[PDB]
Amino acid sequence: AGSLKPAALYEEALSLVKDGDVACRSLRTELLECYSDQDFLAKLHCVRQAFQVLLLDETHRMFFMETGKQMISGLLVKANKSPKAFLESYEDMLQYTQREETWPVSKMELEGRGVVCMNFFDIVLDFILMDAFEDLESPPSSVVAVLRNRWLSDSFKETALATACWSVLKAKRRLLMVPDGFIAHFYVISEHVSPVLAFGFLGPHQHLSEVCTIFKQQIVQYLKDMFDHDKVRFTSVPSLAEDILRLSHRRADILMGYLGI
Ligand SMILES: CCCCCCCCCCCCCCCC(=O)OC[C@H](COP(=O)(O)OCCN)OC(=O)CCCCCCCCCCCCCCC
Numbered sequence: 001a002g003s004l005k006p007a008a009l010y011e012e013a014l015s016l017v018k019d020g021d022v023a024c025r026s027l028r029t030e031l032l033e034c035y036s037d038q039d040f041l042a043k044l045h046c047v048r049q050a051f052q053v054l055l056l057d058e059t060h061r062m063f064f065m066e067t068g069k070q071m072i073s074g075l076l077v078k079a080n081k082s083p084k085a086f087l088e089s090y091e092d093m094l095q096y097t098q099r100e101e102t103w104p105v106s107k108m109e110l111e112g113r114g115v116v117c118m119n120f121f122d123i124v125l126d127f128i129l130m131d132a133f134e135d136l137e138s139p140p141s142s143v144v145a146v147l148r149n150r151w152l153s154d155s156f157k158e159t160a161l162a163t164a165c166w167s168v169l170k171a172k173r174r175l176l177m178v179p180d181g182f183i184a185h186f187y188v189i190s191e192h193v194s195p196v197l198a199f200g201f202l203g204p205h206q207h208l209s210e211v212c213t214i215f216k217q218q219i220v221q222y223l224k225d226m227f228d229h230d231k232v233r234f235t236s237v238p239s240l241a242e243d244i245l246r247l248s249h250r251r252a253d254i255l256m257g258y259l260g261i
Pocket of ligand 1: 055061064065067068069072093097098103118119120123124128129132189190193194218219222248251252255
C-alpha cells in the first residue's frame, strides 16, 4: 500500500480490477514503477478516463499534436536530418485521424493488434511510444553482429542499420489488414523516425546517443510520473486530468528546452 491514501476514483477502479473488468494490452507494472499489477490496472483505468476528458478540449488536443511535431522535429535536426518528410507524414496522419469515418476501420486494425481501448494512452503512449522503445531495446540477431564488426566503417553501419529497419518495417507492412489506414499512415512516420532512434540507441555517434537516451528518458519519466499517486491525484477525474495536463506541459517544456526549440 506504500504511500497510497484512500481515493474515490482509484477505489472505484480497483473494484473493476478485482472483478476483472479492466483490460490492458501489456502490463507495464515494473516499467511504470507501480506497486502491483492490480495497482497498475486501477491507475490505468483512471488515466484512460483522465485523457478521455482532457482531449475533448480542442486546445489540449492541439497542445499534444504540436508537442509531438516539435519534439520529433527537434530530435531529427539534432540528428543532422531534415524534418520535412516526417512533418508531412505526421500532418496527413493527423488529417486522416480527424476524419470521423475512418475510425471504425482504425478500431478494427488497432484491436487486431491487441489495443483493448480507443484511448490516447492505449494508442499513442503504449502502442506507439513504449512499443517503439521496447523494440529498439532488442535488435535482431544479425544487426548486432554487424554492429560489433570492427572492420566496418560506421557510414556502412549507418546504411546497414537503416536497411535493417526498412526490412522489419517491410515485414510488418506485409501484414497490414488495410493498405491505407491508421497503421499504414503510422508506418510511414515510423519509416522516417525509427532509423534515427535506432542509430541513436545502437550507434557509436555518442552525441546522437545522448540526445536519444535523454529523449527516451523524458518520455518514460513522463509515464512514470503519470502513474505516481504522489505526483498526480487519483481521487477524481477532473483532478487527475488537471494534474496530468500540468505534468504534460511541464515535461514538454523540459524536453523542448533540452532539444533547443
Ligand atoms: C514529453 C512527453 C510529452 C507528452 C507526449 C506527447 C505525445 C504526442 C502525441 C501526438 C498525437 C496527439 C493526437 C491528439 C488527438 C488524440 O489524442 O485523439 C485521441 C483518440 C481517441 O479519441 P477519439 O477517437 O474519440 O477522437 C479524438 C479526436 N481525434 O485516439 C488517438 O490517439 C488517435 C490519434 C493518433 C495520432 C497518432 C500520432 C502518432 C505520432 C507518432 C510520433 C512519432 C513516433 C515514432 C516512433 C517510431
